[PDB]
Amino acid sequence: KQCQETCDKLRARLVEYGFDPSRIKDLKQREDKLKSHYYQTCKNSEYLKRRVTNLEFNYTKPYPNFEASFVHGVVGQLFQIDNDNIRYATALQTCAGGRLFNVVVQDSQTATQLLERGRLRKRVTIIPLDKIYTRPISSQVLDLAKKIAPGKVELAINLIRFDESITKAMEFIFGNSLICEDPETAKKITFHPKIRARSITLQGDVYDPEGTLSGGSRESLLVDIQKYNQIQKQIETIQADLNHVTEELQTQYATSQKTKTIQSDLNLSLHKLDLAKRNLDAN
C-alpha cells in the first residue's frame, strides 16, 4: 500500500543522488587495513634506515622558480641490481666507492646553485649531467677481455639497471670498470697491452692501470641500500593505493550529505512501515 511506496520513492531517490551505505562501509574496511599496513611496513624498516644514512640529500630550494625536477637524486638510489647479480654487490660497491652518494643534477648551473644558495648540511659531490665526460670501454676491448678470460669478466655497467635519463651519470661511474672473478683474472686483464681497464676483484680489490692496487682485510652497504630502495617503493605504492581509496571515500560523503534531508526523512518514513502494519493486526 502507501506504506511500501512512500518509502520506496524516497529510497530510490537516494540511488539517483549517488549514496550507498554498503559501499561507504566497504571502503573503511580497506582504509583501516591500508593505514595499518603502511605503519607496519615502515615500522619494520626503520632498522634498515639507520644503516643507510648517506642516501639522503637535504637542500633548501634556492629560488622560487628553481626547477626541482632538475635534481635527480643520489646515485645510490638511482640504479638497481637484479637478484642474479647480487653476488657482485661488493664488487659494484667498490667500483663506485664514494660516487654512490654523489648527487645527479640536470646541469652544471643547478649544481652551483645547490652548492651556494642551498644550505648544504654536509659536503656533497655533484655530477652535472651536461658537463660529465668519460671515455667508456669500447666493444672491442670488452670483447678482448672476454676472450682472455671467458665467463670471468664483465663491464660493471652491465650488471645494473637504470633509466636512460641518467645514462651519463652511470656511464661516468661504472662504464669503465671490468668486474673479475679473482685477482688472477684482474692482473691478467688490466695489465695487458690492448686492454688497459680498471678491474675489480669480486672480493673487493682493485687493479688500476696507473700503479694502483688496493686490498686488505674488510654483504655490506650496497646491499642494504638495494633493500631500502625496494621497501621505500613498496611504501610509495601503499601511500598511493590508500590515497586513491581515501579520495573515493572522502567524496562518498557529499552524496551522504544529501542524506541530511532524504535520509533525515526516510528514517521517520521507514518508521511507518510498522506503524501501519501494527494496526493491520485485525479487529
Binding site: 644514512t53 648517506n54 659536503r123 655533484i126 652535472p128 668519460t134 692501470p209 696507473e210 700503479g211 688496493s214
Partner: protein
C-alpha cells in the same frame, strides 16, 4: 402409564440442572467480562512501565553519545598536536643519525690509518718485507698556506707508496691473516713516467705539484700521479677557469671547494680536510663517539615509543569513530519504539473504556438473571411438592 417413582423424580431433577447450569453459565459470562477489564488494566500497566523503561535507556544513551562527542573532538586535537611533536622528534632523530654516521665513519678512517701503518712498520722491522716506504703524504713537504687545498683535492695522499707490485700484495696478505686493515698502494714500477716540467697556468694560478718539495726525487713522479695540473684557485674563479678554458682543469678553491676534470663539482658544508701533507686535530675519541652512539640509541627508542603511543591514539579514535553512529542508531531505535509503544497505549486506553462499558451494561441488566433465578426455585419446589 405407569411410571415408577425413582424414575419419576429424575424426570424433573434433570429439569433443575438444565437451569441450575444455565444459571452457572450466566455467571461465567459475567465473570469473563470482568476479567477483560482486569487483564486490560494489567497490560496498560506493563506498557506504562515499559515506556518508562525506554525513557531511561534513551537518557543513558543520550548521555553516553553526547559525552563521546566531547571526547572525540578532544581526542582529535590531541592526536593533531601529538603527531606534530612526532615529526619534530623525527626530524631531530634524523639529524643525530647523520652526525652519528659521520663521527663513526671518521673515527674508523682514522683507526684504519693508525692500524695499517703501526702494523706495516712492525712488518718491515722484522725484515719480512723490503720496499715499504709508507704514506705518500709524509714523502713531501708543503707550504702551510695550502694545507687545506691539498688535503681536500688529493685524498690519495693516504695511499702507500711501494716498489714491487708483489710487495704491495705481500702486505695485503699480512693484513688479512691478522685482520689489521685495508689500504691502497701506489706502485712505483708500473707507474707511468710523467713530464714533471712547468706548465703554463691560465689566470697565473699555480699548480699544486710545484708547491711540493719531495724528500727524494724518487717520489717526484708519484706526486705527479696524484696531483696533475691541479690548480689552486680561491673564491670561485674556478667555474670560469676549470669548467672551460681551452684545456679543462681540476681546481681547488683555497678554502676547499672542488671542480674535477670530469665535470664533478664538490662543495662542502662545515668541514674541510687538513693534514694529509706535512705542513689538537679535529679527531674524535672512541669514547666521544661511543657517547654519541650511546645517546642515539635513546633518541632512537624514545622515538619507537612516542610512535607507538601515537599509533594507539589513532586506533582509539577509530573506536570512537565506530561508535558515534552505533550509539546514534540505538538512540534512534528506542525513540522509534517509544513512539510505537505510546501508540499501542492510547489504543488500549480505549479498549478498557469499551470493555468496562460492556461490563457495567451486563451488571445493570439483571433481566435474564431474575428469570433463571425464579425457575430454579420454582422447580426446586415443584420437585419438592410433586
Amino acid at each position: 402409564e405407569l411410571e415408577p417413582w425413582d424414575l419419576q423424580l429424575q424426570e424433573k431433577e434433570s429439569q433443575i440442572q438444565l437451569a441450575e447450569s444455565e444459571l452457572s453459565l450466566l455467571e461465567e459470562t459475567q465473570a469473563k467480562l470482568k476479567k477483560n477489564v482486569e487483564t486490560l488494566e494489567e497490560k496498560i500497566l506493563a506498557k506504562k512501565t515499559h515506556k518508562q523503561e525506554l525513557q531511561d535507556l534513551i537518557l543513558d544513551l543520550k548521555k553516553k553519545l553526547n559525552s563521546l562527542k566531547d571526547e572525540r573532538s578532544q581526542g582529535e586535537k590531541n592526536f593533531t598536536s601529538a603527531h606534530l611533536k612526532l615529526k619534530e622528534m623525527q626530524k631531530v632523530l634524523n639529524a643525530h643519525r647523520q652526525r652519528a654516521m659521520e663521527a663513526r665513519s671518521s673515527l674508523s678512517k682514522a683507526q684504519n690509518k693508525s692500524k695499517v701503518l703501526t702494523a706495516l712498520s712492525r712488518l718491515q722491522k722484522s725484515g719480512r718485507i723490503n720496499g715499504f716506504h709508507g704514506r705518500l703524504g709524509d714523502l713531501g713537504v708543503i707550504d702551510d698556506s695550502f694545507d687545506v687545498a691539498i688535503s681536500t683535492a688529493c685524498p690519495r695522499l693516504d695511499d702507500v707508496v711501494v716498489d714491487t707490485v708483489e710487495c704491495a700484495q705481500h702486505c695485503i696478505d699480512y693484513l688479512r691473516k691478522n685482520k689489521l686493515g685495508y689500504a691502497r698502494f701506489i706502485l712505483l714500477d708500473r707507474l707511468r713516467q710523467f713530464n714533471l716540467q712547468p706548465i703554463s697556468t691560465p689566470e697565473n694560478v699555480p699548480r699544486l705539484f710545484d708547491l711540493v718539495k719531495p724528500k727524494n726525487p724518487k717520489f717526484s713522479n708519484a706526486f705527479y700521479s696524484v696531483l696533475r695540473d691541479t690548480l689552486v684557485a680561491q673564491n670561485l674563479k674556478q667555474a670560469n677557469n676549470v669548467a672551460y678554458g681551452k684545456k679543462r682543469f681540476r681546481v681547488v678553491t683555497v678554502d676547499g671547494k672542488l671542480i674535477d676534470i670530469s665535470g664533478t663539482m664538490s662543495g662542502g658544508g662545515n668541514h674541510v680536510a687538513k693534514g694529509l701533507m706535512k705542513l689538537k686535530v679535529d679527531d674524535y675519541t672512541p669514547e666521544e663517539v661511543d657517547k654519541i652512539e650511546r645517546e642515539l640509541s635513546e633518541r632512537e627508542n624514545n622515538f619507537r615509543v612516542a610512535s607507538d603511543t601515537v599509533h594507539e591514539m589513532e586506533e582509539e579514535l577509530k573506536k570512537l569513530r565506530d561508535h558515534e553512529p552505533d550509539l546514534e542508531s540505538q538512540i534512534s531505535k528506542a525513540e522509534m519504539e517509544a513512539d510505537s509503544l505510546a501508540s499501542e497505549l492510547t489504543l488500549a486506553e480505549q479498549q478498557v473504556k469499551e470493555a468496562e462499558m460492556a461490563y457495567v451494561k451486563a451488571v445493570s441488566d439483571k433481566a435474564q438473571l431474575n428469570v433463571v433465578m425464579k425457575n430454579l426455585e420454582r422447580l426446586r419446589g415443584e420437585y419438592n411438592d410433586l
